[PDB]
Structure formats: C-alpha cells, structure tokens
Nucleic acid binder design. Structure first.
Ligand SMILES: [Zn+2]
Ligand SMILES: [Zn+2]
Ligand SMILES: [Zn+2]
Ligand SMILES: [Zn+2]
Lengths: 73, 73
DNA sequence: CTGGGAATTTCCTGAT
DNA sequence: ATCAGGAAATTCCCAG
C-alpha cells in the first residue's frame, strides 16, 4: 500500500492506525488534542487532496475519523 | 445597522467601491495584488460569513468581484 | 527499520 | 508597514 487514505498524497506509513501522509498525521494529532472547532463552508462533501486539504479542516477531520484514525492505535 | 456585502460582518465603510468590513478590504487588496490562484474544495457555492470566510478565499474573492469591488473606484 | 511527537518555519488572517 | 495568533507541513529526535 501507499497513497494516504485521507488526501491521496503519497503516504509515509501507518499513522494512528491508518496509512497517511506526514501532513495528515500531525493534522489529526492537532485536531484531536484541540477542541476541533471546525465548520464546513460547503455541504460537508469537500474534496480533500494535496491542493485543497488546507481549505476545509472540517471535512479533513471527518475523513480522518471515517478512515479509522485514533490516538491509542 | 448595516453589514459587509461580502461576509455580513459589521461594515467599517465604503472600500474599493463596496460597503465592506476591514478584513474583506485587506483580503481583496492582497488577492488582486497577490498572484493568487484560488481553488474551491466545494461547488463554488460556499457560505461566506464572519467565521467561514477564512475557509474559502476562492468564493470570498468571487463574492468581492460580484459585489463590484475594484481597485479603480 | 518503524512510528510518535516536539520543534521549526512558513503562510494566512486580522488588528494597529 | 508592522505585528501577533493560528494553522500547516517539514525537520529532527525519541523509543521500540
Ligand atoms: Zn494525507
Ligand atoms: Zn468541507
Ligand atoms: Zn467582510
Ligand atoms: Zn468555495
């Protein structure tokens, strides 16, 4: 396997239970330790990839959870 | 008793031809000045308000133009 | 070798 | 024209 399950960018390994890129790894860590205030300006279907992942942390965090990312993994 | 024509936040006056808040004023200036290629992660229909205006500069910039904001005014 | 996490840098936004 | 808070992504060091 390769290709991070969140943003489809090249994956650096298995992080918090899921194959992800380095950027999504630290994003999830930040989001989960913080209070995740995030609001989607769209329909919560936003495209998350290398280009657009910065746009919507709401949808990015959702895709992190849906992929099964968790801290104790 | 009047609001920014872009994000609906309290308007500070008439900026670049349109009633806007200070934040949308400097955003627009920076956007035109700034080479920026913006990409919406959504449908280009994004909700732009006080909180969500940070999410999508693409739709924010579009709303600036649609409202009639221009450096010539 | 693996992955967690701190540190660092850069960028965006908004106020002064 | 600064300046500061925040988010983002890389670099680096840690334990295993
Ligand atoms: Zn990713
Ligand atoms: Zn979204
Ligand atoms: Zn505004
Ligand atoms: Zn948008």
């Amino acid at each position: 396997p390769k290709l991070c399950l969140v943003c489809s960018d090249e994956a650096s390994g298995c992080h918090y239970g899921v194959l992800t890129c380095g950027s999504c790894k630290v994003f999830f860590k930040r989001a989960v330790e913080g209070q995740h205030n995030y609001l989607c300006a769209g329909r919560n279907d936003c495209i998350i990839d290398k280009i657009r992942r910065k746009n919507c942390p709401a949808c990015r965090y959702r895709k992190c959870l849906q992929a099964g990312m968790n801290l104790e993994a």
